[PDB]
Amino acid sequence: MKTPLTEAIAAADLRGSYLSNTELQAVFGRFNRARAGLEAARAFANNGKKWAEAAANHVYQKFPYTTQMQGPQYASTPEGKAKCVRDIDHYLRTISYCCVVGGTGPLDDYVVAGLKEFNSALGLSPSWYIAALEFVRDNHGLTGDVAGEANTYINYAINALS
Amino acid sequence: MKTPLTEAIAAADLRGSYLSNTELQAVFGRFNRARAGLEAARAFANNGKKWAEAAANHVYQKFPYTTQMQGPQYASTPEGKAKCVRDIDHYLRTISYCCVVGGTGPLDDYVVAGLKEFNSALGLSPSWYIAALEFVRDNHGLTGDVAGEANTYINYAINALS
Amino acid sequence: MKTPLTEAIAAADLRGSYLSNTELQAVFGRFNRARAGLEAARAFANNGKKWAEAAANHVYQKFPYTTQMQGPQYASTPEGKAKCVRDIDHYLRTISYCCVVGGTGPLDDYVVAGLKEFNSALGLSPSWYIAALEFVRDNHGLTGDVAGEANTYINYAINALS
Amino acid sequence: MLDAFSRVVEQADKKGAYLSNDEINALQAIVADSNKRLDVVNRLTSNASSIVANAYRALVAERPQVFNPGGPCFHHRNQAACIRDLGFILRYVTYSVLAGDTSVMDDRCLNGLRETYQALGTPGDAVASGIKKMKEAALKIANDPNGITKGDCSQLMSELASYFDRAAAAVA
Amino acid sequence: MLDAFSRVVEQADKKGAYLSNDEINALQAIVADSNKRLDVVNRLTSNASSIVANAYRALVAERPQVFNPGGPCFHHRNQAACIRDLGFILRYVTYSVLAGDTSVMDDRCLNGLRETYQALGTPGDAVASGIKKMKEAALKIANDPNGITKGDCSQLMSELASYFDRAAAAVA
Amino acid sequence: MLDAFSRVVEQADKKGAYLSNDEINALQAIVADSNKRLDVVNRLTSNASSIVANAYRALVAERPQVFNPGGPCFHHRNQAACIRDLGFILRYVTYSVLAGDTSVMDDRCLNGLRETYQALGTPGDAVASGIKKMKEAALKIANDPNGITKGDCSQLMSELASYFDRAAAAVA
Numbered sequence A, B, C: 001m002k003t004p005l006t007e008a009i010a011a012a013d014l015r016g017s018y019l020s021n022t023e024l025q026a027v028f029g030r031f032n033r034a035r036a037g038l039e040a041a042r043a044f045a046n047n048g049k050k051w052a053e054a055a056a057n058h059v060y061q062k063f064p065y066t067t068q069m070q071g072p073q074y075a076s077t078p079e080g081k082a083k084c085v086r087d088i089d090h091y092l093r094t095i096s097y098c099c100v101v102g103g104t105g106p107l108d109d110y111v112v113a114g115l116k117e118f119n120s121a122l123g124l125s126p127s128w129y130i131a132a133l134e135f136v137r138d139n140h141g142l143t144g145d146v147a148g149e150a151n152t153y154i155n156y157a158i159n160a161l162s
Numbered sequence D, E, F: 001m002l003d004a005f006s007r008v009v010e011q012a013d014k015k016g017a018y019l020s021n022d023e024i025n026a027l028q029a030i031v032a033d034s035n036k037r038l039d040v041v042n043r044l045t046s047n048a049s050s051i052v053a054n055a056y057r058a059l060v061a062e063r064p065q066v067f068n069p070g071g072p073c074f075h076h077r078n079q080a081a082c083i084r085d086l087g088f089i090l091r092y093v094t095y096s097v098l099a100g101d102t103s104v105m106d107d108r109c110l111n112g113l114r115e116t117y118q119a120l121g122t123p124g125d126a127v128a129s130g131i132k133k134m135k136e137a138a139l140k141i142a143n144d145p146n147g148i149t150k151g152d153c154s155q156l157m158s159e160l161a162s163y164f165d166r167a168a169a170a171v172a
């Protein structure tokens, strides 16, 4: 996909040459954050499946109509809510991947490309997701650098959905 | 080939969408003439092989040199005249096809594309054909709408040969 | 490759037509020099392997460092000098080919394309070759027309190496 | 590209014969039920999105694994790609109805679709079951008695059925 | 693209040898009959159209079905296409005579001509019989004693014959 | 294109699981020896030309016939082409070291290299012996104790060895 390492290799390749210092110093900077990022991924790996339900609920408070209105694509039924918690998870799981890779790559190919084309066709609304994501943003309660890297990718996701 | 229906499908396809009203109303107009056109095709189907000889003769009056001058590509011989009546036929038969299809399609692909490149290489002259075609134009004696549609395609042919 | 005949065929082909007079007169001029050129090729065929050593030596006088400096790509060793005489030969042999063909073709594809890319990578210097070539230029002692054609291609080679 | 009229002309020119009487009558028939034909074409167009969306939903409920992690259709990029494709089938089936000939669909769309899907790790039989489901909804919309002049557009339906099946057959 | 001189050089460079004496004599020979060679080249050019037109006429009279309804060559689009192609053969045969090498014809023209014609429903053997007929007229024009200095351009003829045959052989 | 981190993520997403603890530890390890990794990458870059030039020289001395008249590598056009190619191998091996994944090399470079070389009359096994020799010099430069902080970049070497071998294996 698209990691900062990969981005650097593509640049060099298009010129058919080895890495320039600027791109070298650029990559050397990657490894200086890898620890922080990985530490974020470890946090999601554990208390992340839970952050899912937490959001699944909060979103029902902002949008009550989702849990009531006879849903062909709504969480009205108990089986529909089961999917809403799975969807929240996927976003989180994908975001964690970004902390590991150290870039937008995962989000870019797994959930960003072709996002709206799909949603606005199956009747799902971006607002439900955007909201439930902000929840985990504040609530996760991550330290600072591990939180610095974790939050960075959450906002990027919130951006694309807007 | 190229029928008005087909033309409409190509338009829509190039946009990767369904038919626009303008193209819909356009097609709906096709079927409102189909009866007339088909009625022309029926007339040619019958007294058309005869319209062939009729023209084969008239053309000999306008161009006597075609039936005399030692012909390598002239109707001088009786075997050469046999081809002149076949050639007239093909034009007619192709024109009838246009009334069925409701467009220039048949003429465009069966006799128009690569017309002059060939003729002006084998020594055949457009003037012989243009003349013998005008003959059947007036002589066929078609009613009015059946004649309206029939004549429309004959002139188009006369045009391309000029 | 690229002979004057060939050049003329390529021109005509790009237009999809037969040869124009200008190109015809152009080719007819080729055969009026073929004898001279071939006579040059015959001279090289014989006393050419000798013109090789002759130059191999002269070049050592202009560049003594080539026959001394511990050579990874120098004629310092007796085995390295053996290659210098082979390299001189190849140039000559290729040049003779040009007199036969009547154009730059041979030089263009056998030794010109990718010349410097290689040399300035393996540490060989154009100056050694340019010099040893000028030697055979003057020394060969060819008549005049046979010499006219022979010299023409030697200079072209000297040009590309500069 | 060839339409119903163009096809018959095509066959007549191969034998170098003027369109026989019976063939003019065959087409006269087509011109007769033309208004019904276009009705069908128009209804599918209007309900396009509705048709495709449900066919997808029915399919996911059928083979749910295909769209979850690991599946050949996971990730939005893919999800939307699959929908897009079903939309393609319907669109060309429609062109086929309007033309009365199946050529457009064959060349422009079904041409090398089996190989593409195959050498791309797509289930194929799952696409066929998607065209099948899309086809049910299509028939029910096009045949709805409400809003149209009461009549018999039976043949038109049998001819619609054929196109979809021809599609599903070419990828499975 | 390779010409007569370029070819011999090509073979000499593979063995890394200066052109032997005998090879210089082989070419000296070619230079000798050069004026005759160009005469041949020029005559075919001038009578180009004449040659191609008749070869067509002779062929239609031979296999008339090929050009009537149903045939692989019906319709002006096709008719003119066939003529165009025969014109192509002659043109490249000419280049081959001027060059004294058959390379140009092989790559630029005969390269994949057999497959093209095959996967396009063209008779192939009929094209060979067309190149054959074109070849007769070509020989008769190029060898016409009238208008040229009297001499023996026998070898030149045998070498012309070879090119045409090489063509017809590659498509049949 | 995929890198070491991207690859592990790739496999985790196929099973739809968050990166397990052990996998975070696997990568933590990679981040640990990163400075050593880049050292290796940088040294190969600097000695690029030197490496390629000698590997060529060693090879010509090995199979001298390959580069003399008749050989698949005669003429400057070719000679320089071969060097260029060896330069390509090293360059992509380097990208592979920096990435810690071998993907880049596989797609962008080794993809259809065996067929290209084959249907082009290139020896293939001779290219493998050229990658082999290039590999020796590469290891000796990258491992030179002089000028770098004394440590153990053993694993890094075993991982460099693997890339070159993977290359030579794909063309022989």
Ligand SMILES: *[C@H](C)C1/C(=C/c2[nH]c(/C=C3N=C(/C=C4\NC(=O)C(CC)=C4C)C(C)=C\3CCC(=O)O)c(CCC(=O)O)c2C)NC(=O)C1C
Binding pocket: A059, A066, A067, A072, A073, A074, A075, A076, A080, A081, A083, A084, A085, A087, A090, A110, A111, A122, A124, A128, A129, A132, D057, D060, D067, D068, D073, D074, D075, D076, D079
């Ligand atoms: C939760 C905010 C609410 C819930 C949403 C909802 N979603 C679906 C169905 C789908 N969800 C997805 C999600 C993904 N699949 C992917 O591969 C990715 C990228 C990794 C995502 C985000 C998809 C593809 C579907 C369609 C197929 C499926 O059903 O799984 C439903 C079911 C309703 C329907 O079939 O249309 C629901 C209900 N509903 C709410 O009201 C929420 C607040």
Ligand SMILES: *[C@H](C)C1/C(=C/c2[nH]c(/C=C3N=C(/C=C4\NC(=O)C(CC)=C4C)C(C)=C\3CCC(=O)O)c(CCC(=O)O)c2C)NC(=O)C1C
Binding pocket: B059, B066, B067, B072, B073, B074, B075, B076, B080, B081, B083, B084, B085, B087, B090, B110, B111, B122, B124, B128, B129, B132, E057, E060, E067, E068, E073, E074, E075, E076, E079
């Ligand atoms: C009639 C006006 C006169 C006659 C003309 C004439 N034509 C030919 C030979 C050919 N006629 C055709 C016609 C077609 N073939 C097609 O496929 C189509 C499109 C559907 C057409 C119009 C062709 C292709 C030929 C060439 C091959 C053939 O001989 O059939 C001849 C024969 C002379 C010759 O071989 O050149 C003649 C005489 N001659 C007149 O003087 C007319 C007034």
Ligand SMILES: *[C@H](C)C1/C(=C/c2[nH]c(/C=C3N=C(/C=C4\NC(=O)C(CC)=C4C)C(C)=C\3CCC(=O)O)c(CCC(=O)O)c2C)NC(=O)C1C
Binding pocket: C059, C066, C067, C072, C073, C074, C075, C076, C080, C081, C083, C084, C085, C087, C090, C110, C111, C122, C124, C128, C129, C132, F057, F060, F067, F068, F073, F074, F075, F076, F079
């Ligand atoms: C002579 C001026 C001196 C000598 C030069 C020298 N050259 C090499 C090695 C090579 N020579 C060639 C030459 C060609 N091969 C070709 O195919 C062509 C085009 C037809 C040419 C001109 C090549 C390719 C090489 C490299 C491979 C090989 O070794 O044969 C050497 C050997 C040193 C080395 O390996 O780098 C030398 C010494 N040296 C002098 O100092 C001269 C004055």
Ligand SMILES: *[C@H](C)[C@H]1/C(=C/c2[nH]c(/C=C3N=C(/C=C4/NC(=O)C(CC)=C4C)C(C)=C\3CCC(=O)O)c(CCC(=O)O)c2C)NC(=O)[C@@H]1C
Binding pocket: B024, B025, B028, D032, D033, D035, D036, D038, D039, D040, D142, D143, D144, D145, D148, D149, D150, D151, D152, D153, D156
């Ligand atoms: C068969 C699918 C259903 C059915 C159809 C049916 N259609 C007609 C007649 C018409 N259809 C028309 C179509 C168009 N196309 C347009 O662009 C357009 C707006 C400008 C229309 C209305 C059309 C113009 C007619 C004629 C007027 C009309 O009655 O609408 C008929 C009647 C018989 C006929 O073929 O003329 C039927 C029966 N009937 C069914 O039972 C099926 C559900």
Ligand SMILES: *[C@H](C)[C@H]1/C(=C/c2[nH]c(/C=C3N=C(/C=C4/NC(=O)C(CC)=C4C)C(C)=C\3CCC(=O)O)c(CCC(=O)O)c2C)NC(=O)[C@@H]1C
Binding pocket: C024, C025, C028, E032, E033, E035, E036, E038, E039, E040, E142, E143, E144, E145, E148, E149, E150, E151, E152, E153, E156
């Ligand atoms: C063999 C095909 C026939 C034949 C040819 C023949 N040709 C010559 C000599 C010449 N041919 C010339 C050709 C060109 N090329 C031009 O562009 C051009 C106009 C500028 C000409 C005239 C040419 C210049 C000559 C020399 C002068 C001349 O006599 O025309 C000859 C004579 C012997 C020779 O090879 O020189 C012959 C015999 N002779 C035949 O019997 C064949 C029919």
Ligand SMILES: *[C@H](C)[C@H]1/C(=C/c2[nH]c(/C=C3N=C(/C=C4/NC(=O)C(CC)=C4C)C(C)=C\3CCC(=O)O)c(CCC(=O)O)c2C)NC(=O)[C@@H]1C
Binding pocket: A024, A025, A028, F032, F033, F035, F036, F038, F039, F040, F142, F143, F144, F145, F148, F149, F150, F151, F152, F153, F156
């Ligand atoms: C293994 C191949 C050899 C070896 C390497 C080794 N490297 C270090 C530590 C560093 N490597 C650095 C690399 C870069 N990258 C740059 O862009 C750059 C200039 C800005 C440098 C210097 C780097 C910055 C360090 C840290 C500081 C330093 O000591 O150079 C070490 C020490 C242990 C460690 O991994 O940190 C080693 C041992 N040691 C060997 O024995 C091999 C020959």
Ligand SMILES: *[C@H](C)[C@H]1/C(=C/c2[nH]c(/C=C3N=C(/C=C4\NC(=O)C(CC)=C4C)C(C)=C\3CCC(=O)O)c(CCC(=O)O)c2C)NC(=O)[C@@H]1C
Binding pocket: D066, D072, D073, D078, D081, D082, D083, D085, D086, D088, D108, D109, D110, D113, D116, D120, D122, D123, D124, D126, D127, D130
């Ligand atoms: C949905 C029912 C199923 C499904 C479909 C799917 N399609 C693709 C990607 C492609 N689809 C096509 C087909 C066409 N492209 C066209 O332009 C046309 C009209 C002529 C057709 C018929 C092509 C060419 C591709 C590849 C290029 C592209 O993506 O546009 C995918 C993606 C497969 C992948 O992982 O790359 C999928 C998944 N997938 C399913 O699971 C359903 C069964």
Ligand SMILES: *[C@H](C)[C@H]1/C(=C/c2[nH]c(/C=C3N=C(/C=C4\NC(=O)C(CC)=C4C)C(C)=C\3CCC(=O)O)c(CCC(=O)O)c2C)NC(=O)[C@@H]1C
Binding pocket: E066, E072, E073, E078, E081, E082, E083, E085, E086, E088, E108, E109, E110, E113, E116, E120, E122, E123, E124, E126, E127, E130
């Ligand atoms: C005439 C003797 C016979 C005949 C020929 C014929 N040719 C085509 C169409 C093509 N011919 C070629 C060949 C070439 N194109 C080139 O540019 C060159 C020079 C390198 C050659 C040799 C090609 C490529 C085509 C296809 C593309 C095109 O039309 O230009 C046809 C048409 C076949 C059809 O129905 O599409 C025909 C008929 N046909 C005969 O019956 C004669 C035996």
Ligand SMILES: *[C@H](C)[C@H]1/C(=C/c2[nH]c(/C=C3N=C(/C=C4\NC(=O)C(CC)=C4C)C(C)=C\3CCC(=O)O)c(CCC(=O)O)c2C)NC(=O)[C@@H]1C
Binding pocket: F066, F072, F073, F078, F081, F082, F083, F085, F086, F088, F108, F109, F110, F113, F116, F120, F122, F123, F124, F126, F127, F130
């Ligand atoms: C040198 C060790 C050996 C050798 C190599 C050689 N290569 C060519 C020509 C080509 N090499 C490639 C390969 C690539 N092109 C690329 O862009 C990339 C990166 C993805 C690769 C790996 C290709 C495609 C060609 C053909 C096109 C071109 O020349 O650029 C040649 C020339 C063969 C010929 O005679 O045409 C040679 C000789 N030759 C040897 O003898 C060594 C064993």
